[PDB]
């Protein structure tokens, strides 16, 4: 079993790490960071070519605390995700100078961040490529996770995809497909009527689009509505997929959001996914 939970996102939440319930039980427990991003650190924000920058908040998720949950809880790996969709009230647009040049930083700057954090991985989302096209970003992203991995920086690789960007990742998955462990597809990316039979239908639409790659399904606990809601019928999805042996995971965003609905949401994922 896998869970993973996105943290750091919205800003100023307070949330932290020990904040949220973790369910012993669950082989294998994943925070994810979010965000880095290779964007100036101060306004107004700009590109750096792969220059990454931290923009969580790490006096409250630091190397410490994340030494500390993961000693506590034996079944926790820690991650970071790259990108995101806004930096202040700017957009995240992938942008390389070269694939070469791009790459060289990604590699300097990540080894630096996931070394420094004692992290195990990295995740993939950017959501904007009006500024680059799909062989660039495949190219830039397949070779940095590569190296990374080659290099013993990282253990394990994601990618967080939705329909609207699917041409950018299905480059990145045909082109690199060993080198990505799984897929945290965002399903609150469609409409907030879809049902429980369209749901299931997306689902195989996505397994069958990324085809060998093993995608999670997901929900989140925003205060906007998205997909097919969480307590709405998501566990029925979630029951079927079970029973068929199509279910590799549970992705949610974000424990920042879920502050507000007491981790309600989050207890009761891992709980289902154990059972």
């Known amino acids: 079993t896998l869970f993973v939970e996105y943290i750091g996102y919205p800003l100023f939440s307070g949330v932290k790490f020990s904040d949220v319930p973790i369910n012993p039980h669950i082989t294998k427990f994943q925070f994810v960071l979010s965000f880095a991003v290779d964007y100036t650190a101060s306004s107004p924000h700009t590109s750096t070519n792969g220059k990454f920058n931290v923009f969580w908040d ?153 085809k060998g790659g093993n995608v999670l399904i997901s929900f989140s606990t925003g205060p906007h509505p998205g997909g097919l809601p969480v307590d709405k019928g998501f566990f029925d999805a979630a029951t079927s997929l079970k029973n068929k042996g199509k279910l590799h995971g549970i992705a949610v965003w974000t424990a920042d959001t879920s502050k507000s609905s007491d981790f309600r949401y989050e207890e009761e994922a891992q709980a289902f996914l154990v059972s």
């Open 58 to 210: 790490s006096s409250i998720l630091g190397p410490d605390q994340i030494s500390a949950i993961k000693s506590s809880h034996p079944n926790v790996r820690v991650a970071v995700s790259l990108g995101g969709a806004s930096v202040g009230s700017n957009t995240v647009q992938f942008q390389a100078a070269s694939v070469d040049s791009w790459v060289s930083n990604a590699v300097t700057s990540l080894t630096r961040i996931i070394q420094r954090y004692n992290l195990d991985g990295i995740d993939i989302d950017y959501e904007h490529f009006q500024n680059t096209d799909k062989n660039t970003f495949a190219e830039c992203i397949g070779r940095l996770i590569t190296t990374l991995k080659k290099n013993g920086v990282i253990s394990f690789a994601s990618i967080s995809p939705f329909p609207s960007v699917d041409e950018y990742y299905l480059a990145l998955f045909n082109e690199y497909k060993n080198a990505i462990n799984h897929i945290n597809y965002q399903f609150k990316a469609y409409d907030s009527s879809t049902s429980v039979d369209k749901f299931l239908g997306y689902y195989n639409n996505a397994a069958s689009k990324y």
